[PDB]
């Protein structure tokens, strides 16, 4: 029965994995039935025109589409039609709360809303980037993939991560019911390689309390 007990998965797998490698994959996170329900909720968001072009933290002159080709919407988890996405978010949060004080030196107190994202085939992807390069509070990226029948050799869409200090990169296929964690800072630059079929994923970013407070102070003072 999935999801697995959070305490053991967090302390005996996620924590040591994250501290050693900065990247952790949990396959078959919620099971087929729940994963399919999430897929249907995501496809209904897509079908009803909720997605908008993905955006960047800062922009000068470049079109966002020369950088990221996905379309997204932000989900709080309590919206009608998003109940199973809410269960996913609650399950991610459960894991993080069982990791309190054990993920590096971070104190994780909060997170973003969920970013439901679609790369609509057609070779769309995301150029090599860092999720939080300049201290905006994000310390852990958590992604759930929902692509049933994804054949990455044909459809592409691999997330390639270049973890600092390793002799090989980490290729993450966007597999159905796969959960991924990685450090959001400069230790993990990464690319979404071009996707040739419709590719869905849901991301939440967890905040380190002290860094996020400093970032909010900068925003609220116009700096």
């Amino acid at each position: 029965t999935k999801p697995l007990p959070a305490l053991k998965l967090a302390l005996e797998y996620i924590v040591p994995c994250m501290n050693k490698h900065g990247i952790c994959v949990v396959d078959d996170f919620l099971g087929k039935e729940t994963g399919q329900q999430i897929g249907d909720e995501v496809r209904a968001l897509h079908d009803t025109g909720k997605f908008t072009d993905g955006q960047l933290v800062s922009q000068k002159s470049d079109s966002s589409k020369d950088i990221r080709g996905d379309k997204i919407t932000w989900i709080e988890g309590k919206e009608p039609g998003c109940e199973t996405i809410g269960l996913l978010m609650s399950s991610m949060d459960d894991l993080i709360r069982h990791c309190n004080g054990k993920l590096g030196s971070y104190k994780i107190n909060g997170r973003t809303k969920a970013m439901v994202a679609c790369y609509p085939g057609n070779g769309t992807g995301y150029v090599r980037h860092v999720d939080n390069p300049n201290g905006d509070g994000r310390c852990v990226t958590c992604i759930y993939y929902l692509n049933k029948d994804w054949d990455a050799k044909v459809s592409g869409g691999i997330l390639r991560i270049f973890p600092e200090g390793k002799a090989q990169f980490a290729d993450i296929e966007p597999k159905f019911d796969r959960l991924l964690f990685f450090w959001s800072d400069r230790r993990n630059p990464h690319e979404v390689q071009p996707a040739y079929a419709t590719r869905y994923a849901i991301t939440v970013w967890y905040f380190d309390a002290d860094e996020r407070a400093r970032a909010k102070v900068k925003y609220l003072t116009g700096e």
Binding site: V57, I96, T112, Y126
Partner: peptide, 20 residues
């Protein structure tokens, strides 16, 4: 060196963080 914030995925700064 490139300003990496121009490649980084947007998040709301203003009133939209969730407390755990």
């Amino acid at each position: 060196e490139l300003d990496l914030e121009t490649l980084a995925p947007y998040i709301p700064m203003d009133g939209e963080d969730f407390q755990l």
